[PDB]
From Swiss-Prot, chains B, C, D:
EC number: 3.1.2.-, 3.1.2.2
Reaction(s) this enzyme catalyzes, per UniProt: a fatty acyl-CoA + H2O = a fatty acid + CoA + H(+); decanoyl-CoA + H2O = decanoate + CoA + H(+); octanoyl-CoA + H2O = octanoate + CoA + H(+); butanoyl-CoA + H2O = butanoate + CoA + H(+)
Function: Catalyzes the hydrolysis of acyl-CoAs into free fatty acids and coenzyme A (CoASH), regulating their respective intracellular levels. Has acyl-CoA thioesterase activity towards medium (C12) and long-chain (C18) fatty acyl-CoA substrates. Can also hydrolyze 3-hydroxyphenylacetyl-CoA and 3,4-dihydroxyphenylacetyl-CoA (in vitro). May play a role in controlling adaptive thermogenesis.
Gene Ontology MF terms in the entry: fatty acyl-CoA hydrolase activity; metal ion binding
GO cellular component: cytosol; mitochondrial matrix; mitochondrion; nucleus; spindle
Record's protein name: Acyl-coenzyme A thioesterase 13
Effect of residue 65 to A: Reduced acyl-CoA hydrolase activity
Chain positions with N6-acetyllysine modification: 9, 19, 25, 90, 109
Entry keyword annotation includes Metal-binding: yes
Chief site of localization: cytoplasm
Length: 130, 121, 121, 121
């Protein structure tokens, strides 16, 4: 539903470009993006580092959608890469808040190929609140 | 043009077999909403410089990412000079394992450390 | 005899394509100094249940562990009944990837979540 | 009595600020079915020695595991002597960071590397 325009940003979050926010519920966010040149590596696949940026941004969004408003600072992120996404493809980014304590929040993120429903990558992301 | 453009301002200071050191000044385009080195760019740095260390080996094969983790220990503020140093830990016929430290150039203190497993060939 | 003796008390609930469920009661033998499920036993569980999940396919090849990560979200105390659920995320020719959730049997609440990559052949 | 019984055979070699060194000979007790160091024990060793390195600072606080990762690079065969070297990467206000390298004593080749984040109080 909502278009989001990170391209208007001047800091690093600008690398996401045009993403659409599909839904945002308590502790769950779904976004999509078409993979564009700006997102790719030389081989024309979603760049490992944009994947991480998505894991970082989209999980933060899910924590913004919590009863506590706080984005937190990263402590530990991990990502497993499973299949490539190609220039021109739509990916969907699904972030879940697994647990939110008073000091720590834990999130998970799947990127899936929208066409095949197959996971591109899964990230877990621990953040320190306050 | 593509995502590699975001590394444009890094300078490679040293490369040696299985080991590479780069430096970079943290500028606005590198920052998150709060003015420190974006976590996403730290992972890009981990990915690219680690890959550079692998390329700097006899078999100069870059591999494709399988597993990456990063632990964030201290923030790197806008205008700080960071040092990124990447080491090949082991390189097999199929799998290579690399580690990467990001340090604050002025203090010597770790910003973040990453390990990055890659699949070769 | 060997190290899997530590798994003597885990009950296998079901193995199915892409998913394995075990359960256990944490006894003293399973705990740390603070009387909660020892983090190393959790890691052992993840390693084990995910390898079991890999076997559930025609290529019932166990593979060698490459990278595991575990995030510990809440303690599993002594006397608690716990569920351990491996899912297979992807099984390729050379690499297989699995996720493992440890949950409280009573509440469903998440104790820990692991991901585990293995190198097949 | 509890899970640490499995570390009965580790020897403490030295405990210095920021660095603990331990050793063990890997016995059948410690192996998997392939007769190599069990990946679950390896993870136990990371969790435990890393905690030791913490416990040997002015704040002798063990903390609770938050995130742990391990990458396995070579097997430690039965009858091999191995070294577990934990390093304190940072001790902050509520979060402490540790690294752990398992090596072959004779050759010094990396068996496995872990990082471990613990939460203090």
């Amino acid at each position: 539903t909502e278009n989001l325009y990170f391209q208007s940003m001047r800091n690093f979050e600008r690398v996401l470009g045009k993403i659409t926010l599909v839904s945002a519920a308590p502790g769950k966010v779904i976004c999509e993006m078409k993979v564009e040149e700006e997102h790719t590596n030389a081989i024309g696949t979603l760049h490992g580092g944009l994947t991480a940026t998505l894991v970082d941004n989209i999980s933060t969004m899910a924590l913004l959608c919590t009863e506590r408003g706080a984005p937190g600072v990263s402590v530990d992120m991990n990502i497993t890469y499973m299949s490539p996404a190609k220039l021109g493809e739509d990916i969907v980014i699904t972030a879940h808040v697994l647990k939110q304590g008073k000091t720590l929040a834990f999130t998970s993120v799947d990127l899936t190929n929208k066409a095949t429903g197959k996971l591109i990558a899964q990230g877990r992301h621990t953040k320190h609140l306050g």
